[PDB]
Nucleic acid binder design. Sequence first.
RNA 1: CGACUCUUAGCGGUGGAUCACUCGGCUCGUGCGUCGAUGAAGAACGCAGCUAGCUGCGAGAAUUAAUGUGAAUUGCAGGACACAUUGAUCAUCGACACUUCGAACGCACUUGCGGCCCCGGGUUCCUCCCGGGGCUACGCCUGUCUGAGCGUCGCU
Length: 59
Amino acid sequence: KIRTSPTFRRPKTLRLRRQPKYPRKSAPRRNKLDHYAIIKFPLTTESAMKKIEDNNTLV
RNA sequence: CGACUCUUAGCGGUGGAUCACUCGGCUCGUGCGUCGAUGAAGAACGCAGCUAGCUGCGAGAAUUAAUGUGAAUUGCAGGACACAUUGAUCAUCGACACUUCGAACGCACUUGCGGCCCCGGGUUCCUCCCGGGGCUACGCCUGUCUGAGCGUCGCU
């Protein structure tokens, strides 16, 4: 070809995607952050009830 | 007289010696002689109906399953187990599960910021938003692919 720059750069090559012969872990881990784990229990304090009545917010 | 002071004895007290005890040590001896990227040791934070610490455990958290055992656990309560339409408790333990750091592994140590490939929901191939899953560290070995070289050459 032709060289127009005095700098030699590392030529770009081919990079294959991973095609494993086996998965390293047998199964995906179960998501232990479901809806039941997110909500633990409501608050029932005096401040909490004031938000339910005067603010339309659950705590 | 008393008070005060001294001594002795009795009894009572500031005190915890002595004696008796010991699920603890120390020493000797015997048999084994086994950790970890399939993530160790060590940390952190959590987990009980009432439970702070010790202990045990890991979001299935003072435990699940299985086997053996065979009627308890216990401080209170509650309800199992009808005590074979097979099972309380305990032991054993080979199945399952095992949060965050840590050799610690996408980059960085602040609950900071990414990238690639998939899945679900809003919209519909904006992959734009949210949620989830799998990968994404260094060194090094065999092989594989893609390359470089006025390195040595061959055919042109």
